[PDB]
């Protein structure tokens, strides 16, 4: 009922090789062609990838800046308020970006800021202005 293990006996395959007197060596040669074409492709992409790998030499170490550690203060300096408004204008709703720009404010505090001063800082206008971009 079942072929031996390690033995692969499909209907489609048998009918496919039986058709001709040498459909055997035909299909087998086709497979050899597929095989070699594939390995060629491998060589190719291996070399382009080796080239790209050569470009990235140096990493980004020269361009990495140290990390500011400023604790979150609840009070909003007029400085930090202005930072904020600009940050909105550039980032829109990305509250995280905004928090990182200001540095000593958390995202919740950010949202609060949004709400409280939403009148006085016309934050509506600001957001739509960012949306234009």
């Amino acid at each position: 009922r079942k072929p031996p293990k390690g033995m692969f006996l499909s209907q489609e395959d048998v009918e496919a090789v039986s058709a001709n007197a040498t459909a055997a060596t035909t299909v087998l040669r086709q497979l050899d062609m597929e095989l070699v074409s594939v390995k060629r492709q491998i060589q190719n992409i291996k070399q382009t990838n080796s080239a790209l790998k050569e470009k990235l030499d140096g990493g980004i170490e020269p361009y990495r800046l140290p990390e500011v550690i400023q604790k979150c203060n609840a009070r909003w300096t007029t400085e930090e308020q202005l930072l904020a408004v600009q940050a909105i204008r550039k980032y829109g709703r990305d509250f995280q970006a905004i928090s990182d720009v200001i540095g000593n404010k958390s995202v919740v505090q950010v949202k609060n800021f949004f709400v409280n001063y939403r009148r006085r800082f016309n934050i509506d206008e600001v957001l739509q202005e960012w949306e234009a971009e």
Binding site: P4, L9, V14, K53, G59, L83, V101
Partner: protein
């Protein structure tokens, strides 16, 4: 089994059932009550048992009944019916037994038996046992036919049959009890030696062997489970089936490799797109960094837009740096995966040259067992006797197998050197025209009631006919004779003066250089006490090697031997013998096989006796005059010796029944 079931087993019979034959002889029993059937069965088994427990003497009905116990010894006519049925079809009192009731004073009916091969001898001994006038016509100057033993001094070696394929249910068991045969076990271990003389490593050995068996099983699965049995309009042979299975293996291998390398490609391309990403990212990070520096240049105090600009670019830059570090992690992962894939590649090939060579040797072994190119065996049916295997280890006859036919020919009327040239069977009897093989003008005529024809299927196959049948065999029997297969197989006896091989090794191989030459001298046997080695030639090679002189052949032999053992170790053979069976005109081959397009059914056709047309027109359809026996006739055990012998016993029973009458069927 053991007990009376043991006997029923030993006699190739189901201890708990009535066979079709027994049904025919005893239709009152089977159609009747189960109880009685069981009685019958026990009577049969117990008689069997008796004979078997001592087959050196005749088992008379009186004796049988005397040793029977109640209630089984009540219905004495049943006991008698049974005893006779058994005696008749030689399930008992067959072979060579001291006759209790001395042979009948005056004979009855006349039977001419063509050929004193084993089937022949067996039947003849039975027919004589039953009191007919039997006479045998052997073309040769010796008995046995395809049981042939070379002897010179103490050198003794079978060019014919040689192996007893197991004793469980083998009549030959009985015969051996009757005849002094030095039987010896066959140590199954068989080393292989590539063309060079280097032994094949156990790794290789077992791997190949296993893949072989798996291939076979594969073909079988192809055959029965898939009904792969007719490619073109031609039937399919084992050969083609194996070839296909193999080609599918190679193809599958290629598929595996391709899938794998393609996985690797896909991954490589992922890596590519990744790298591109990372590079553009580093560019953006470079430019950002620059801009941040330029914004840091603007020294404080600064209005808030400026401060926002520095803070901004710093945020953005730390961001892109983050992103890039992630991408670098991902690159790490892709790279190690690619090392994994590139580290685990599927098998390079399906079969190497050494592999395919050893495989070829296993195939040569197969072609040897069946004595024919696997291209010829019937895919479906080539293994149909397989379900009747004897149990036990296969043995060899140390003192030459011929010791048996000879022993069978004691007391028989045999005419050696008599080639039968024509068989004439008529409504009123038969006449058989034969010539003296020595002086082929010296003619003989033999007239008789019936003619039992143990002519080798090859001889029957001959064109133009070695033996003429008048009137001609009918279309159905001829066609059966054309469809069947007769194979070829030869042996080379090498007689040296001292043992230079492994005396604990019974058989060892030699792997053929090519596919074509895989049969060519592929196997050796040390079975004899004497320094005698036996080389085999099978397959395609067996037919071609017959057109080559002895000396050349023994040449190639000693060559391979030297290659395996060393040039300063292989003496010249004091005596050398080479069989050519396909040449032998009293054989025309080795034994039969189930050619593609043939089946077992044709073995049955070969057995069916012939009934001649009526002399006077409008006369009753006669008695059957022409009977066939022999190895090619017995569906469940062809190409053997036990096979022959049984066919002989069978026909003798049939013939006797026909002319002396069966009194046990009432």
């Amino acid at each position: 089994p053991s007990g009376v079931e043991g006997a029923a087993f030993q006699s190739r019979l189901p201890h708990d059932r009535m066979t079709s034959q027994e049904a025919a002889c005893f239709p009152d029993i089977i159609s009747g009550p189960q109880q009685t059937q069981k009685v019958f069965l026990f009577i049969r088994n117990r008689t069997l048992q008796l004979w078997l427990d001592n087959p050196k003497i005749q088992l008379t009905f009186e004796a049988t009944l005397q040793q029977l116990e109640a209630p089984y010894n009540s219905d004495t006519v049943l006991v008698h019916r049974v005893h006779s049925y058994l005696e008749r079809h030689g399930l008992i009192n067959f072979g060579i037994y001291k006759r209790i009731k001395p042979l009948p004073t005056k004979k009855t009916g006349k039977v001419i038996i063509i050929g004193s091969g084993v089937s022949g001898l067996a039947a003849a001994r039975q027919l004589q046992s039953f009191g007919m006038d039997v006479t045998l016509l052997e073309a040769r100057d010796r008995v046995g036919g395809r049981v042939a033993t070379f002897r010179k001094g103490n050198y003794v070696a079978d060019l014919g049959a040689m192996v007893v394929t197991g004793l469980g249910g083998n009549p030959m068991a009985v015969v051996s009890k009757q005849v002094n045969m030095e039987l010896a076990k066959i140590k199954q271990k068989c080393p292989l030696y590539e063309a060079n003389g280097q032994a094949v490593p156990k790794e290789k050995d077992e791997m190949v062997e296993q893949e072989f068996n798996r291939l076979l099983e594969a073909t079988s699965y192809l055959s029965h489970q898939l009904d792969f049995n007719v490619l073109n309009n031609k039937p399919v042979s084992l050969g083609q089936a194996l070839e296909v299975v193999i080609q599918l293996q190679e193809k599958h291998v290629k598929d595996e490799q391709i899938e794998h390398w393609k996985k690797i490609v896909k991954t490589q391309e992922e890596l590519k797109e990744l790298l591109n990403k990372m590079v553009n990212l580093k560019e953006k990070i470079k430019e950002l960094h620059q801009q941040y520096k330029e914004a840091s240049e603007v020294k404080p105090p600064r209005d808030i837009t400026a401060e926002f600009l520095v803070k901004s670019k710093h945020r953005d830059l730390t961001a892109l740096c983050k992103e890039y570090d992630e991408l670098a992690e991902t690159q790490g992962k892709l790279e190690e995966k690619l090392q994994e894939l590139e580290a685990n590649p599927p098998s390079d090939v399906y079969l190497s040259s050494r592999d395919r060579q050893i495989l070829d040797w296993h195939f040569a072994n197969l072609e040897f067992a069946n004595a024919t190119p696997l291209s010829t065996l019937s895919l479906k049916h080539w293994d149909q006797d397989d379900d009747f295997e004897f149990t036990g280890s296969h043995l060899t006859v140390r003192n030459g197998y011929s010791c048996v036919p000879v022993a069978l020919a004691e007391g028989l009327d045999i005419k050696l050197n008599t080639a039968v040239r024509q068989v004439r069977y008529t409504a009123s009897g038969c006449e058989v025209i034969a010539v003296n093989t020595r002086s082929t003008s010296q003619t003989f005529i033999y007239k008789c009631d019936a003619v039992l024809c143990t002519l080798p299927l090859g001889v029957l196959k001959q064109q133009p006919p070695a033996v003429q049948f008048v009137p001609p065999l009918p279309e159905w029997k001829t066609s059966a004779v054309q469809r069947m297969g007769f194979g070829n197989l030869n042996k080379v006896v090498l007689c040296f003066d001292r043992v230079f091989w492994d005396p604990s090794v019974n058989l060892f191989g030699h792997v053929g250089s090519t596919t074509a030459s895989r049969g060519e001298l592929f196997l050796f046997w040390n079975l004899y006490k004497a320094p005698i080695l036996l080389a085999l030639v099978a397959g395609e090679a067996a037919g071609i090697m017959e057109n080559i002189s002895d000396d050349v052949i023994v040449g190639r032999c000693l060559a391979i031997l030297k290659g395996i053992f060393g040039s300063s170790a292989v003496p010249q053979p004091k005596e050398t013998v080479v069989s050519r069976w396909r040449a032998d005109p009293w054989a025309r081959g080795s034994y039969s096989y189930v050619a593609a397009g043939s089946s077992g059914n044709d073995y049955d056709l070969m057995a069916q006796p012939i009934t001649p047309g009526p002399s006077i027109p409008g006369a009753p359809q006669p008695i059957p005059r022409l009977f066939f026996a022999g190895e090619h006739t017995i569906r469940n055990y062809p190409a053997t010796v036990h096979g022959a012998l049984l066919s002989g016993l069978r026909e003798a029973g049939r013939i006797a029944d026909q002319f002396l009458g069966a009194m046990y069927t009432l």
